[PDB]
Design a protein around this ligand. Sequence first.
Ligand SMILES: CC(C)(COP(=O)(O)OP(=O)(O)OC[C@H]1O[C@@H](n2cnc3c(N)ncnc32)[C@H](O)[C@@H]1O)[C@@H](O)C(=O)NCCC(=O)NCCS
Ligand SMILES: [Cl-]
Ligand SMILES: [Mg+2]
Length: 163
Amino acid sequence: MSKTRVIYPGTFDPITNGHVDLVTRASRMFDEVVVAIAIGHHKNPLFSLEERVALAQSSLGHLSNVEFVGFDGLLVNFFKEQKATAVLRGLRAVSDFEYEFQLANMNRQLDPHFEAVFLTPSEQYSFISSTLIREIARLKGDVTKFVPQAVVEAFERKHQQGW
Ligand SMILES: CC(C)(COP(=O)(O)OP(=O)(O)OC[C@H]1O[C@@H](n2cnc3c(N)ncnc32)[C@H](O)[C@@H]1O)[C@@H](O)C(=O)NCCC(=O)NCCS
Ligand SMILES: [Cl-]
Ligand SMILES: [Mg+2]
């Protein structure tokens, strides 16, 4: 019996309570979990790589089997470099499901060792996404209930520099 290593890739822009729940659930089932923050070089995230990594560490660093790394390039090359057992993704809607079904099949064609496992959110996180959270924050809504406190403060310090 070997040691399992799953990657959880995303932009995490910012990390939410939904992501936290997924990583916590995953850390019970695999030996190592890698929170893999896509840099988004040609995709314009609101938070920098350093901010997104720090928010993720702050929220999840208490889990001793979770690592945090930024990456770019082809997910399958990262998968190989990392020697992962699988990629993990959350499926919160039908459109998520169809996109991920397609991508898992494309990635398996690029690398036959590739694997993707999916979790479904618990109902109390099911309506949360990073995009929606950015939008509420931007229109000065309170996102406290949906994201870790550190993220709330991070939005206040974008709102303080101006935003
Ligand atoms: C697809 C990319 C950008 C990351 O995905 P995404 O932008 O959805 O990140 P986000 O951080 O918002 O979410 C991460 C994942 O957890 C899920 N999730 C988000 N919120 C929640 C919630 N409340 N509950 C459950 N799941 C959730 C998402 O649906 C997603 O699967 C990234 O994997 C990537 O760019 N890969 C590298 C490039 C590549 O190889 N591209 C195409 C060739 S296959
Ligand atoms: Cl996003
Ligand atoms: Mg999201």
